[model samples]
Target: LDFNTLAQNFTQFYYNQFDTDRSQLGNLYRNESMLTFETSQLQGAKDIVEKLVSLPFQKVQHRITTLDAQPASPYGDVLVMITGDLLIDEEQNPQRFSQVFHLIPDGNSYYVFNDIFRLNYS
Candidate 1:
């Protein structure tokens, strides 16, 4: 469980998946599931933390950041905080924001069962 490697890989995954297109917002859902489940199977929980370092980003018109992590029930469960910003128009400008991501392990990978984001006023 190398945190550095995990972080790098996580970052690569984010860029490979999210940096290219705005229409692929739906893809985030699937990628989120892949990250959660894959990370859960790692040798130690810290691996999860390391991997998460790369999961944050602001692209096109959105920015994502992880704010926290918490222990969960049934042993290896974890809660992760993710903040997001969305572009408001074709000009590719951010007009909304949110901060929420909850993840739990299922089988060998973690699954994101809950997510919340909101617009920032002013």
Candidate 2:
């Protein structure tokens, strides 16, 4: 598949899993995977999932407004950047968020090697 297609699929899979079953998202990360959620930093799949599951929201939805992707390395790694709106709980106004994922190829699929997420304040 092309890099853009991979990014699109991964982004869709990610937010769906995130809004539905956050615990299952651990499978997308490895032992060395890292996540920067806001200002806090976490490493390893377990730690990352723990933080995600502990977020202070009962329900959340992500709407991607823009997405960009590129080849990060000669090894077929992909870099994905996304801008989106996050509607959590019953909030009337959604917050804008920017997220980036460094996807490293593993066999036939990919895993997130590094992830950074931040809510845009305006």
Candidate 3:
């Protein structure tokens, strides 16, 4: 598979679906997908959807300054790392964000096996 193209597509599709429509992100994960947003650890599609939809902010943008991808194994799994800034609504302050995703690649598709997200503040 083409790692560069896949990463690019994932990045684009990711920010579009995730930042805009949280409900659109369900198909990316399976029943056992893990998502870590902030300090809370959540598993399964239901919890992740709850966490996404429950967020008070409606207007959000993820400005990714850098995206890096690497092969985690020979079994078509990839580790994607992203560093950027996040803007959420008017009340939310613009902050730096770091996110890591462990995706299991299958041909032209990918599943979120693990995910971690953090907002950096000083």
Candidate 4:
């Protein structure tokens, strides 16, 4: 698919789901070089899944931030930013945080190349 189509599909899938599975994510990075400027490390397919699954889930009133970009490799590149909001429960309230995601293309799909999570202190 083209970059726009891929991006739309990705956004729809991720925004609606609130969380992405690691297995599905691998399709974006398989057999490709994934580079993360924030982490200063290049990751393989296995490394990507390992890192994603290990991320901590932010609790209510706390937001977890992340981002995804594409086409920094052999294919088209685009950047996707993701900010997560904490859903309020009986004892908690809503909060928002921001994260940046950089994705690179593997074959016909895109994989997350870099992610940085930060709190909005403002």
For residues 14-109, write the lDDT of model 3, one tens digit per residue.
Answer: 788888788778888879899999988899878888887888778888888888888889878888888888888854567798988888875687
The model with the greater TM-score, 1 or 3, is 3
Per residue, candidate 4 scores C-alpha lDDT tens digits across 5-90 of 56656655544343434344555555444534335454776776566555555322334344343545564666666566645443
TM-score of candidate 1 on Cα atoms, chains taken together: 0.43
Q: Tell me, by TM-score, which candidate is best.
A: 2
Worst 10 residues of 4 by lDDT: 58-67
Q: Tens digits of per-residue lDDT for model 1 on 3-91? A: 33333333335435445642343423333332233224322323433444344444444455434555545576555554555543345
Give the winner by lDDT: 2 or 4.
2
Residue-pair clashes per prediction, in order, are: 8, 0, 0, 13
lDDT of 4: 0.52
Model 1 global lDDT (CA atoms, 0 to 1): 0.43
Tell me the whole-model lDDT of each prediction, alpha carbons only: 0.43, 0.91, 0.82, 0.52
Q: What is the lDDT of residue 31 in candidate 2?
A: 96
Evaluated at residue 78, the lDDT of candidate 3 is 83
Best by lDDT: 2
Global CA lDDT computed for model 3: 0.82
Instruction: Report the lDDT tens digits of candidate 2 across residue range 1-122.
Output: 47788888888988899989898999899999999999899999999999999998988999899899999988789999999999899687999999999998877678999999999974
**What are the per-model C-alpha RMSD values against the true structure?**
11.2, 1.5, 2.3, 5.8
RMSD of model 3 against the true structure:
2.3
